């Protein structure tokens, strides 16, 4: 459950990251594939090698959906309805994979955001990503 403070930390950090988000997310994907190779299984159909254009392209789709989540913090189940379909009905993704990805995302932000990645910013983002996870694994 995000507080009102958590929501402001999430909105403020997401707007500052801005146009970099797709970059940060590709790097998150690359970190997940390399630290948890088992997750490559779900991506057998694309080139998952480090700087691939499939990864940038997928990084962008994921960034965009997270931007949408940031715009609808008060009703994520409705904004992310369609992504729930994809992740819980069509792909049947093990939720352990979301922990992997969330952690690789925070790892990336901790590296790029420097001093703006405070313990409070960090705590709020972690609750945000867990909340997106719970919805995407849904039904």
């Amino acid at each position: 459950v995000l507080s009102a403070a958590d929501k402001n930390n999430v909105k403020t950090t997401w707007d500052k990251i801005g146009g970099h988000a797709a970059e940060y997310v590709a790097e998150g994907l690359t970190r997940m594939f390399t630290s948890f190779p088992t997750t490559k299984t779900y991506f057998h159909h694309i080139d998952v090698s480090p700087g691939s254009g499939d990864i940038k392209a997928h990084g962008k789709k994921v960034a965009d959906a997270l931007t949408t989540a940031v715009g609808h913090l008060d009703d994520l189940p409705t904004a992310l309805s369609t992504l729930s379909d994809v992740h819980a009905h069509k792909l049947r993704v093990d939720p352990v994979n979301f922990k992997f990805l969330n952690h690789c995302l925070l790892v990336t932000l901790a590296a790029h955001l420097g001093a703006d990645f405070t313990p409070s910013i960090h705590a709020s983002l972690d609750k945000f990503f867990a909340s997106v996870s719970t919805v995407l694994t849904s039904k």
């Binding site: 790892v107 313990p119 960090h122 705590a123």
Partner: protein
Amino acid sequence: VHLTAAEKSAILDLWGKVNVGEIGAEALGRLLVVYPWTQRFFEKFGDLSSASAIMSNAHVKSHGAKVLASFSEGLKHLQDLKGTFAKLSELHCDKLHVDPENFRLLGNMLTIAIAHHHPSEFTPCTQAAFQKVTAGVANALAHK
């Protein structure tokens, strides 16, 4: 743990530059902010009811340093993590009753702490080695 020779040296190369006290303060300090129920285990430290009080508390800095020194020590006995960690296993499991899930959260805070302090060195490959090691340390702590 396997740990191949390339993994061990990814780990040691970076570790040679690491500030044990800063990383350990960062790691333990984030565990308590991010995963608030862990505060219960450290009430002998004083006020932990805000990020500001956590990041300022001298017992957190000093305990975080102690925790990282023993991680550091574990790194010199990569072939026997269980033997190395067996007394801490007993302490944490039998005296303190710390659910093993929490060992893994600290291992993850420690990865974040190293990415935050060594932006340029903490590449996807270097992170990969450190996930296994932190996973090994967690598993060795959970062994009793």
